[PDB]
Amino acid sequence: GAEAALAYLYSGDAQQLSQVNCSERYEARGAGAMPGLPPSLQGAAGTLAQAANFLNMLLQANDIRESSVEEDVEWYQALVRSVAEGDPRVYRALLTFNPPPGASHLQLALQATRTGEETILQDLSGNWVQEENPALKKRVLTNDLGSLGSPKWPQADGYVGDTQQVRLSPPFLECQEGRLRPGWLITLSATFYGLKPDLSPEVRGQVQMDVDLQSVDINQCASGPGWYSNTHLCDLNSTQCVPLESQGFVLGRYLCRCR
């Protein structure tokens, strides 16, 4: 639906439960402007590019760790319960090992779901059958000689990404059984990297976040790293406006009179 969706942007708060029977995700086809990680979402893309490194140096040093992921499912139940806390505004936190190459099933994808003072954990591996849906990589030479008795290899080379490669998503709101929940979320992604036995662009994995944007203060008639920026529709006399509220994520609710 779009009849309610739009009139949910403009002063749509929850007005009579803006439900339209659904199966889709209404994106924001406007000046979302793809801001580029507002400094508020700077803790998040930090804690989400570390949990893509802890799993980046653990599948690149002992490759047998890619064939026993169903017996080590006590160590991956502590990551997705950590990504689910890299911010005080979180909805989900989700890990999806990719299917084995040239295969079908998804192989062990979890999910945590903040519900206030709680975090519920589920296995959505029997639903996302066949995965229902290379980068800026700089080598970091692993070196081991420290009189360590646990490993027995001098030197090997891994691949590591950073915290300015987390990907964004145009703001959306999904529908729950068909009855749109009003939240205006946004998703942040990442990507593991095992070792292909020549190179290392093999992308097995992904870890994702869901953040709530119904508490940020959009700013139509100013200039900043916000989402809708300088979008004011002033029928200008001489262009004197005033954004006047502590509004949430409501587009076009300034006051352009300012005589």
Add this chain to the structure above:
Amino acid sequence: GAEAALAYLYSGDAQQLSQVNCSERYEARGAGAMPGLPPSLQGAAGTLAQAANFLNMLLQANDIRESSVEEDVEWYQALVRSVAEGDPRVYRALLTFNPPPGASHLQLALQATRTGEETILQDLSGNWVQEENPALKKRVLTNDLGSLGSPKWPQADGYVGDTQQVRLSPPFLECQEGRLRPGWLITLSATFYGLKPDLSPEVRGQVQMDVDLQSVDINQCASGPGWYSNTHLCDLNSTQCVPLESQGFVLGRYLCRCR
């Protein structure tokens, strides 16, 4: 030494290798002001309070994971090789499991050490014998029912901290065999929490960072979240100054003439 130390702050760059035979760590006994995490050190204290959560929900759900830490020493060799990359200005990254309660030795402390395009890993467990050297904790109710077949427990309660509890350290520079290295570092800390079999203030562990501050631009005669702030020693005519450089971490090198 302090004769060289001070004349290393003021325009001391590496002037004739400011070495004085040493065994100590010269701190900064001045207006370091304890700024409060300048927004530049905001990625760091993010990636360092996640690796204190991944180890916070893994020793609070399966307590036998506290009695086999020397056989699981392939999973803790991937953390300290991740904390060592939560920033582009890093020197070390160090994990120290505390000694077993009522015991002596340190029990498996590692260290990574950035050296450009490298990271060296060592076991400093035979040196820090006898550990040579409760918080703001909010409960997060672990809930498990997701048709998971890997665990078999409905509900239990853990403890979790956040990314505004990373601790600071007054800027210092240490001495290497006695010959002070000029770096002006700073350390960021953290803390695990296992389960005492009544409560959960048992603090077994710590993960630490070392950051280089010889590239930040100190600002004596302005106002901000910097380290030495509004420290200008203007023999004021009417207090018109000018901080004039892109200086590093050099105290008192403005120009207070500005007639």
Add this chain to the structure above:
Amino acid sequence: IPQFIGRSYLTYDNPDILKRVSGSRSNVFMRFKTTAKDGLLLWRGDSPMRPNSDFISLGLRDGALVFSYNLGSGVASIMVNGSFNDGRWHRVKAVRDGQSGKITVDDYGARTGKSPGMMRQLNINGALYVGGMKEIALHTNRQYMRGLVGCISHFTLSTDYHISLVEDAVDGKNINTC
């Protein structure tokens, strides 16, 4: 002794094993395996006079591991339940804090066992029997009268002192073929 078959008992002599159990803490990491419905795996406890004998225990009553630390004033009967009677390996960890500890099984969960009576720190003399006792019926406990079977393994007591089960004993039998 790995690979018990019968009433094979096992005592201990080293004054270091005799001391880590006695105190305000206790740990065990017995990686046992069994095909029985009762038994005894650890019975450090002084000469049992009138029931109070400051005894510790780790039984396997009818598929229910029962950490049974006592101080005389108050008994403790912590318990887990499952398929422990038959099958394969199982990882125990019977932590204590003087008055409180778990019986944490492999993954079931930390079934905490708060059960003091008034006091703490009374763990007292006696040898550390593992896997049984030459005769156990006459002893005041009289609960682990049989079931002394299994194929025991790693036994790192007090989270530091890794122990070998034949290298530090003085008695027993039948190291192999279970």
Add this chain to the structure above:
Amino acid sequence: IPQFIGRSYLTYDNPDILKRVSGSRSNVFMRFKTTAKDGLLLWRGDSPMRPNSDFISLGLRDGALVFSYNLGSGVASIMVNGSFNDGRWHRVKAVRDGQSGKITVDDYGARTGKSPGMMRQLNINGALYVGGMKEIALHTNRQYMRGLVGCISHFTLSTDYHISLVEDAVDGKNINTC
């Protein structure tokens, strides 16, 4: 078959096991154990005519696991070295990519094995022998003429198809007592 003692061989029939090996990929997770200096653990390879027989292998030459995948045009002789001749369990993983793969041992490190001759994708017919072969000297390989011992374990081929080593076979001997 767990617990080989002698020349115990083992063949396979299921057309799913016969297909995951043949292709542009291969995986193994044999958790074996041995007290020998040679042997054979996997010999899928068609009737060996003139040496090129598109054979794969996983030997234990004098304490040196040797992934020996072949395509006819070019042999491969990947190798690790250690104390594999005697001792306890060991975790293999012989990944392939059509022309390149590891022989990753427990923790030694991924000794990569780039060794094609010109081409790829020629894995061809024949049964999947594990642990040996009824007679191996007459076969063109003639390298794994003895050492067919050990006590084999988990064998999850192609990272999906978990396989039982007696439930899907047609031959062999002596399941227990190694």
